[PDB]
Scaffold this active site. Structure first.
Site, PDB file in Angstrom:
ATOM      1  N   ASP A   1      -2.072  -5.123   1.122  1.00  7.01           N
ATOM      2  CA  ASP A   1      -1.468  -3.944   1.741  1.00  7.01           C
ATOM      3  C   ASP A   1       0.003  -4.157   2.174  1.00  7.01           C
ATOM      4  O   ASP A   1       0.820  -3.223   2.123  1.00  7.01           O
ATOM      5  CB  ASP A   1      -2.302  -3.513   2.945  1.00  7.01           C
TER       6      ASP A   1
ATOM      7  N   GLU B   1       0.823  -1.208   0.000  1.00  5.82           N
ATOM      8  CA  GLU B   1       0.000   0.000   0.000  1.00  5.82           C
ATOM      9  C   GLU B   1       0.864   1.268   0.000  1.00  5.82           C
ATOM     10  O   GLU B   1       1.903   1.307   0.654  1.00  5.82           O
ATOM     11  CB  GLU B   1      -0.872   0.014   1.270  1.00  5.82           C
TER      12      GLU B   1
END
Ligand SMILES: [Mn+2]
Ligand SMILES: [Mn+2]
Length: 194
Positions: free
Chosen positions: A108, A80
């Site tokens: 992420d 992310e």
């Protein structure tokens, strides 16, 4: 009021990354001002989870390494916060090197200890709702959801981090909520999730 809040209460690099994100995917932060705060929050939680350091050991900021990294060094690798092409390049290198399964969705973080990708989410509502929303698409990748009032839900009740690092995230979320409420911004921010 909310845009002022975000700019005063999140760190400058977080705000920069969030504004970038909104310019790209075609969201106007003057209109979607609650979403601007939510993107800031999501970024901050991910960076905190990964224990990522934006200043290097030689005393210089290295925000550039999100989109143009060097080696791929610590327990967590951030996914992310990066340009999407570069995020997929990192995911692919990781799968090549570790033999981990290549996810269908962009996660992420990668956890080199547990050998799994992690999907993070932050909610203003009851934690199970957003957990299930995520989990009924995502079918492999470990899910960890945080709410602003300190609850969590994770795959297999495995929270990955220790109690202390989890508490640091929870504390930061409580502070954001608190400060929003002080400015009269929390009720709108909560209601806009539905
Ligand atoms: Mn993500
Ligand atoms: Mn996420």
């Amino acid at each position: 009021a909310m845009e002022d809040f975000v700019r005063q209460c999140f760190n400058p690099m977080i705000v920069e990354l969030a504004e970038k994100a909104m310019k790209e995917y075609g969201e106007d932060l003057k209109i979607e001002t609650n979403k601007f705060a939510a993107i800031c929050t999501h970024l901050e939680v991910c960076f905190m989870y990964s224990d990522f350091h934006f200043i290097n050991e030689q005393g210089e900021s290295i925000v550039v390494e999100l989109d143009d990294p060097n080696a791929l060094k610590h327990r967590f690798e951030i996914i992310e916060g990066r340009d999407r092409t570069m995020a997929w390049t990192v995911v692919n290198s990781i799968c090549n090197t570790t033999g981990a399964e290549k996810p269908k969705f962009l996660p992420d973080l990668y956890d080199y200890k547990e050998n799994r990708f992690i999907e993070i989410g932050v909610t203003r509502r009851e934690v199970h709702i957003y957990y299930l929303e995520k989990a009924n698409k995502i079918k492999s990748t470990h899910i960890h959801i945080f709410s602003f009032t300190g609850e969590e839900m994770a795959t297999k009740a495995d929270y990955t981090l220790d109690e202390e690092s989890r508490a640091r995230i929870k504390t930061r979320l409580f502070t954001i909520r608190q400060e929003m409420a002080n400015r009269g911004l929390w009720d709108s921010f909560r209601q806009s999730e539905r």
